[PDB]
């Protein structure tokens, strides 16, 4: 029941299964491909709170994976280490055969807690979590993955964030500059804008002068 596209002399055509197309030639399996695409390629928002809201927990639904031959580079790729409020892990560490997504400019790594009632976090729109070369229906712990889809055809830094309320609607995130230095995370800040905030604070030297961490408001101006 899975659709396939083909490359014609004109454009990308639907590969039909009811009509046998006698102009479609396949001399070898080396003409077959599986390509990974990111959701950001269709305009989907990448800011952390706008991303985690699209993920959530379920149980009784076992995970499945498929592979890739090739795919898109991610501008924004994610890596989670989320614990339950009691300190236990939300997600199991990724299993053998899983390695992180191969190419990305910015990785958004989030350390934090929140309710995790299921076995796994599943994508709410049905998108796949993309690992090195495998797509998965679930998020695995500690592994870098892109958010996306797969098509079948016939022919770098990391930003750390802290989090609370990971599994809730009312949540909060911080951008990390230093161990005791945080700023409130806001959706108007792109990875570059956030790094500019890191340059400003780090360079001025006006960092926490107490034993605990302090959080900066960043003025909306």
């Amino acid at each position, epitope marked *: 029941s899975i659709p396939l596209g083909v490359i014609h002399n004109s454009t990308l055509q639907v590969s039909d299964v009811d009509k046998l197309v006698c102009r479609d030639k396949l001399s070898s399996t080396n003409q077959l491909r599986s390509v990974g695409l990111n959701l950001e390629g269709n305009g989907v928002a990448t800011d952390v709170p706008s991303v985690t809201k699209r993920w959530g927990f379920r149980s009784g639904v076992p995970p499945k994976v498929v592979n890739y031959e090739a795919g898109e580079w991610a501008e924004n790729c994610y890596n989670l280490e989320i614990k339950k409020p009691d300190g236990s892990e939300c997600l199991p560490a990724a299993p053998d055969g899983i390695r992180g997504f191969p190419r990305c400019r910015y990785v958004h790594k989030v350390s934090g807690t929140g309710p995790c009632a299921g076995d796994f976090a599943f994508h709410k729109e049905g998108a796949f979590f993309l690992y090195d070369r495998l797509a998965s229906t679930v998020i695995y712990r500690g592994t870098t993955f892109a958010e996306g889809v797969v098509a079948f055809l016939i022919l770098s830094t990391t930003i750390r964030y802290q989090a609370t*309320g990971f599994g809730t609607n009312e949540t909060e995130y911080l951008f990390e500059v230093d161990n005791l230095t945080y700023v409130q995370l806001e959706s108007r800040f792109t990875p570059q804008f956030l790094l500019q905030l890191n340059e400003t604070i780090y360079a001025s030297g006006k960092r*926490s002068n*107490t*034993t605990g*961490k302090l959080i900066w*408001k960043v003025n909306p101006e």
Partner: antibody
Framework: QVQLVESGPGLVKPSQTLSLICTVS??????????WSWIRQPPGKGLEWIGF???????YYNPSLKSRVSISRDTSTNQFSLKLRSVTAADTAVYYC???????????????????????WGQGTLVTVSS | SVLTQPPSASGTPGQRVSISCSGS????????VDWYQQLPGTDPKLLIY???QRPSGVPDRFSGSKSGTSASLAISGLQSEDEADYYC????????????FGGGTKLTVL
């Protein structure tokens, strides 16, 4: 370490300007990277903030007093003071001078703010407003 | 006294107790919330800052949280020395940097 010590008349008459001064020692609230403030606690009440002043000249005031309160300082004496015009019976309170943690204040290019808040209290001076 | 706090709280020594705080997005849902402990007869001391950080000198029984426009102080086993007026506070953005304290909660040790 830094002391902030209140001084004033104790008894102030209704309608005059109340003027309380804080003497600072052990550091310099008036010229270092600090905010400081005045706070009052009427007997039987909670803590009501009066106003802030950042050493470079940045101020904030309680909305109920925006038309009544002025905070200023002399960096040559390391003293600062609170002036409240038209003092009334409702203003009887223990007035405190207070320090906002210093070195905790980021002022940036525009779209930046601080991470500051309060730690050190003065002793408190009771101001009675009466005839 | 903008941030709503219960007028009182109580428990026996060793009891886990807590004090709530409630405001708006201009304050609690804006900035972080600090807490102060005012022992009878004296000025309040910073007890909690940045929602859950302890000032040096504050014991491990003190903790807290922030969510939405609500906040909370908790004591993981109440001591007799904790009888106090507790206050929550944060910067109020709608008033352009107004410092706001809550009403103050009288915690009684039983």
């Amino acid at each position: 370490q830094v002391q902030l010590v209140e001084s004033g008349p104790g008894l102030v008459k209704p309608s005059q300007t109340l003027s309380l001064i804080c003497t600072v020692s052990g550091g310099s609230i008036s010229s270092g990277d600090f905010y400081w403030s005045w706070i009052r606690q009427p007997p039987g009440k909670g803590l009501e903030w009066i106003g802030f002043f950042y050493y470079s000249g940045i101020t904030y005031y309680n909305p109920s007093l925006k038309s009544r309160v002025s905070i200023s300082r002399d960096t040559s004496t390391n003293q600062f003071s609170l002036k409240l015009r038209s003092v009334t019976a409702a203003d009887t309170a223990v007035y405190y001078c207070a320090r906002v943690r210093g070195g905790r204040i980021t002022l940036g290019q525009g779209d930046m703010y601080y991470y500051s808040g309060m730690d050190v209290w003065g002793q408190g001076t009771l101001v009675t407003v009466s005839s | 006294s903008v941030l709503t706090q219960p007028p009182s709280a109580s428990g026996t020594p060793g009891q886990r107790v807590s004090i709530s705080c409630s405001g708006s997005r201009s304050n609690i849902g804006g900035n972080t919330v600090d807490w102060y402990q005012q022992l009878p007869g004296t000025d309040p001391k910073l007890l909690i800052y940045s929602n859950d950080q302890r000032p040096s000198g504050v014991p491990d029984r003190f903790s807290g949280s922030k969510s939405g426009t609500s906040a909370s102080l908790a004591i993981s086993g109440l001591q007799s020395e904790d009888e106090a007026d507790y206050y929550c506070a944060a910067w109020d953005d709608s008033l352009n940097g107004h410092w706001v304290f809550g009403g103050g909660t009288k915690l009684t040790v039983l």
